[PDB]
Design a protein around this nucleic acid. Sequence first.
RNA 1: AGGUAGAUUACCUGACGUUCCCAUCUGUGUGAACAUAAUGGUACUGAUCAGGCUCUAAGCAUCUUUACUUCCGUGUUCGGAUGGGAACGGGUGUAUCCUACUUGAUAUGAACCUACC
RNA 2: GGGGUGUCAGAAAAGUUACCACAGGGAUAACUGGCUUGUGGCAGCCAAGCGCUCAUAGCGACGUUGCUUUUUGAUCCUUCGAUGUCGGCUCUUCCUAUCCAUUUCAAGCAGAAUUGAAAAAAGGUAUGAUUGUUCACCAUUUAAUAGGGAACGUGAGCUGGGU
RNA 3: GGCGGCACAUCUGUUACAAGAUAACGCAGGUGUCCAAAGAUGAACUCAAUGAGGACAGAAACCUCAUGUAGAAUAUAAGGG
RNA 4: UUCCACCUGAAUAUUCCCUUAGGAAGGUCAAAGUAUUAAUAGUAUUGAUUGGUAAAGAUAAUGAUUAGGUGUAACAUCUUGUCAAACUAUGAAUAAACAAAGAAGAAUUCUCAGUGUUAAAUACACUUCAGGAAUUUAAAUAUAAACAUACUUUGAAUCGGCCAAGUCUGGUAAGCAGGACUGGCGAUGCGGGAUGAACCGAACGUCGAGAUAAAGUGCCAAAAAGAAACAUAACGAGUACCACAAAAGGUAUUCAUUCAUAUUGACAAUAGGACAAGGAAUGUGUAACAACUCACCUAUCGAAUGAAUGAGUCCUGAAAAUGGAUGGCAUUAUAAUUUCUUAACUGAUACUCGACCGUU
Lengths: 60, 115, 200, 165, 279
Amino acid sequence: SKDKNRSSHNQSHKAHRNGFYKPKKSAYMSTKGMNVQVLKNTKAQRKFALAKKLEAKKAA
Amino acid sequence: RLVDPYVTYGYPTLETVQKLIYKRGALKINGNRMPITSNCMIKKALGDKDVVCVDDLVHEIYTVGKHFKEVNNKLAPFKLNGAKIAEKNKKIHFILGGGFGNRELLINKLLANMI
Amino acid sequence: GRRPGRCYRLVRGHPYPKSKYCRGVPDPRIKLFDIGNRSAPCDDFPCCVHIVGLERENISSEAMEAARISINKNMLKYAGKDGFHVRIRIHPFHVLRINKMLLQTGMRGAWGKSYGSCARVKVGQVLISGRCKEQHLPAMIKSFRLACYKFAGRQKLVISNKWGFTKYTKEEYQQLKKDGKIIADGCYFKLATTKGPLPK
Amino acid sequence: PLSNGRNRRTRKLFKRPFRGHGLSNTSTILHTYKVGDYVTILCNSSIQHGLPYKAFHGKTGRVWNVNPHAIGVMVNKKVNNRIVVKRLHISPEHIKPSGCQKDFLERKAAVAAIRKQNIQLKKEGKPLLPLPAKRLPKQPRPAELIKGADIKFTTVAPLKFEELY
Amino acid sequence: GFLKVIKNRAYFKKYQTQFRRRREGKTDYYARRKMIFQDKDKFKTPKYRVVVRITNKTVIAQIAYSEIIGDKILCAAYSHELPRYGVKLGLTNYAAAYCTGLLLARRLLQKLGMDKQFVGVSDAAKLGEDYTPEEVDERRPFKCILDVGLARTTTGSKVFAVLKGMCDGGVYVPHSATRFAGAGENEEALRSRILGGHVAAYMKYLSGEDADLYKKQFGRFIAAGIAPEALENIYIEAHKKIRENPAAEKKEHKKYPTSKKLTLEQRKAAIQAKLAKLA
RNA sequence: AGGUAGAUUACCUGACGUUCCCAUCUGUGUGAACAUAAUGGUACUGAUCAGGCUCUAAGCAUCUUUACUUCCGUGUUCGGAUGGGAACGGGUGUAUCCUACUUGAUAUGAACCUACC
RNA sequence: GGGGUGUCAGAAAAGUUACCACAGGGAUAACUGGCUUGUGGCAGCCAAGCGCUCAUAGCGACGUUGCUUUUUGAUCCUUCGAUGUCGGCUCUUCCUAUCCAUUUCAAGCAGAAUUGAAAAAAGGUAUGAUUGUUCACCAUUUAAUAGGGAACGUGAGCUGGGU
RNA sequence: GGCGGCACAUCUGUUACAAGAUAACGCAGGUGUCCAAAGAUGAACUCAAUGAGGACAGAAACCUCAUGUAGAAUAUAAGGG
RNA sequence: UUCCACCUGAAUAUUCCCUUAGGAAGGUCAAAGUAUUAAUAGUAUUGAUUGGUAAAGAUAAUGAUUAGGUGUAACAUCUUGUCAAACUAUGAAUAAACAAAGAAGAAUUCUCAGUGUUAAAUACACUUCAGGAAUUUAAAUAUAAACAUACUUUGAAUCGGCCAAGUCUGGUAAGCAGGACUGGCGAUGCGGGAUGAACCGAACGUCGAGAUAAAGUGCCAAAAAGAAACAUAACGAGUACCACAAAAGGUAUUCAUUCAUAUUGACAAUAGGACAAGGAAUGUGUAACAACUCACCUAUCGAAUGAAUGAGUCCUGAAAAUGGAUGGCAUUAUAAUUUCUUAACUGAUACUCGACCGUU
């Protein structure tokens, strides 16, 4: 009862029906694994800007 | 050239462009393939492209003007009749006496029997 | 106990030369590839004829040797010992395999064993070349036609307009020899050039 | 039937260029990579540590992170019927700056050179220059007249066959 | 006869030359690429080195940072300009190595304007101790890396005499006090070599052994009248004089053409003349 | 012109001979001390009586090599396409892409920072 | 972390049924048929030599080209809710690569007896000992006692010796 | 089908078609280990081979110079470095 | 395994399994439900690359291999002939992955902060090119794309496949076994190939009229007349896949090329000689000398002759079993084969136009 082992036949036709799904833009903007110092620098400014924005809200 | 075995083509004359548009002309309006009946419908579609009647349609296509891409895209593909396609058969190039490939100015004879 | 020639005539598969992975190869039938006046200078024999193979096929070493023997015997009879030089221009570098089957045996689980040697020739490839004098040209043509009966497929006799195994046609070799660009080398010629350090 | 080793079928891919063995340039370790740059991943088999997978060889990616010793490169990988984003960290030995935007970055500078003069010509009131014309495929050549003064004719015909032998 | 010369075209076709400077025996590219590699997240920030090369007659010190176009020298100091500071003779001693290293530090610090907060040590009493520049207020000292090239780093090697002078000059160079003229005994052994005590003890040793041997080795010292006792004091003043004016110093030079090429016209004529003579 | 550090890594290499050295570099003298080894040959240090002998560098050669260009040659091979030809084997025509080896001509380095002449 | 599952994503596991049984399978073997033709069989081309001299009356080495399905292989397309599986007896028909008889040509054809080949398949091609035998090998007789096919012709035709 | 083999977990070159993937009980081989150093680092040196010399010493003992792009070595199969 | 019409419409890869007649993850598919949407490409062009296949090479590295010079069998050295799936310097075609302006369509000027790098920074890095304000601005290859594009959820069936080939491997080979790319059949009818799952044309709602495709035009069978040739005294030829034929031989025939004799006289034939001209005189032949005859030379006679090579066609090679298959009849300066000429013709459910039904 030997059988055919493998074939790539019809595989490209199948893969192109619903064509190659591209990744979304948000996939290229991930930050995990970035430089430790650059993350430390970015977080410091974001905290500074947010705290300065919030005191303006309290003022007005 | 890549699709040569499936098409035949050539260089149209002014009369071929005139008769093709006059008899088989149609425009894609609102997703509908509406045939050309008046100059008012031409102005409504391609008026912003400085094309208002059926003669600027012919002139812009024939001379390949600055608005060819937009004017040609609005033109729906022509549905033509049948004709004696080849001398031997359409399985060989027109150079070898067949049907497909580039016919240059001899594409007009095929279109005359096809329009 | 040799299979018919129709079994190993088509060029199939990658070349399978004798190497460290292909052992137990029987020795080829043909050992001599140059016959006749092997040491005759390039100026004695101006004529040149070829056997051109018009078929893409394997040529067995057995058919090479059988053709070599017939040309050798026919030529010594006609052109003598010092009247011709015939060179075989195909070598048996391809090894054919046999799947020998002897119900006490397998059916299809096996691979070929070394069976013999052959050359993978192509269309227009020169098989055998020769050179002799003007008077002995008919001897070549007759003996070369008889040799083609030992090969398979289509062969054609070509009478080259060049010199005796050179690349120059007969008048160019004549004028290059008289100028001094041709130097005798026992059985061939050396091209004098204008390169390298000058002499003193 | 191949095996499934990490560096299978790499006899010729990982072989060094002819007469190109040994140490590499110092421009490889001195080039400055910034986030957003375009680089080409080139597996240098002379350095076995940190060798990128052979499937990324010759692919053009973008720099997404810069570390003290390695450069974060981002490439697109084709999977069953989708494309995924692969984020590698490769030492500068195995990457190389890409010229994929060489022509584009020139066209960017050419239009900015004209734009600089435009903001100055507007102050003086003179007409301002137009932006460079866009690239087009080879257009049909126009009609041209050829002088007969320095013309020479050579007949072209089929050739009589001559046997090479 | 038998040759079997392995220099045929097959040899040269597959031959791969080394790097040009390694081919010249001047660059250890394996060690160089370690000292040139700045951190990739320090974009284009120079990684300074000290190139200390000692010739047969002078000590060369240069502060360099590598670039793709080529190495760029920020500042340099030589021992052949030492006589301006009173060191007339012996420009390759352990003492002249120290002065050149010290002079380069002061010359560099003045260029950057940081010569007032970074002073290092000045008194000769504390010359033999290991000193490293430290932070002043919040400002770090100028940092450099030592590049010894193809020089063996033994205990008493002069490449660390230059490095010792820089640290005393206020420029921070990472190091350990295990390859100084001391690294054994104490600071008095290092101080004696820096002040030329080893030099001004062979002059007197040779005098007590043989007069002609004395004139052989120190012949130009008698001509200049430099007594052995004077060597110790002149190096004290040279350090003092270096620290008060290191700002470098201030034409058409006679050029000597050497051989010049032959054009394609003369080269063709030479071949034809040689061929014509043969006939 | 020379020296230091280089980047390109043979147009930079290899062999045969030639040309200067005024500074520089090199070769050169010595072994007391740091340090070194079986050996002051190397590496180390102290020095300056001599020298262009070598190195380095500049140039020479119908020099090997290497590097560009033509040619090789639209010849090898190749993507697309017959109810095209052939009993096979293999090989057209059409719309296209088009190497390599060889040979011949030219070249034998360009170029960055610092110092000194 | 280690102890380990090697059938390596990891049950704890010996045979034999000819006394056998069930669900199924032409997904798969034993017979025919079909593709192939190595092997078996038959036929050619060349011509080194054999044949007292003489390559070809008769042969034909070294090579090389085909045909056949009368051997045995190779495969697994049909048949597993079954195509009765060997031989012999009986009987008809077909092929020719002709054993005899008829007509011819050639010979190393004097006669006789033979040998090679062409036309030709309308007619003939036996009796027995041993063996189930196909085959084989013997004893005869004959003008000759040729080779094969038809589901390896032929079991609601027999027989049942073989299996 | 059984007997054989393991193509059952696995690595290298090739078949394999210059991205990736990639068959056969296709081809040539390999693994179930070995290492307190054969791991880490620093320094010094240059290997195989050949030519010419040196008491025994010779084709092979050790010493010296020159040439030497790796033709050696790198635990192992093969391929890379 | 039980009613109808309508719409969409597959599969044989990959991973794991005591797995191999079966399952689960996943791919293909349907139905529902969304989003104004940094969310288009089985394409080409231009630009910078990647690769090591075809090819190529072989005193270019590894390995194999024939011979010839020169110098000191051997070794060097210069040549020569032929090679590699597990050799390679070089290296295509077809390809792979980039870019051609989305922190949301550019750019510039001014102002400018937090951290850190830095010797220190006004350099540099990240922070919506932190942020903020003015001015300018819709430009940046071709083509196509709003019933576009991006999908989300839920779920079916399937993972025995088979065929073709300007492809490959094992095998002598197979309507054999196994693969790379694509198109098919399966799931598919229609026109043609007589017949046929896969070939060719072309994919289908019910119809009318026309131009067509493959392919055909003696009759069966709708439709063609003319032109030239190589064939055809034979079951020769006659619609690819396809249902078969080879080496070889022929004073069979047609065309082409090359050489020689070709006339003032070749070859064929007739006569004399054969000692302008004759070989110890060629064969027959006399025991041998002799005679006839041959090569050869004269005489006679007045248009081509002789040899080689190549390409077509024909004949031989060519033998199997029920009677039979260019499909049959039949054709034979064709009604066969090859090529043409003629604004000749026939013909599909495909194309055009029109009428009607349904889906969107």
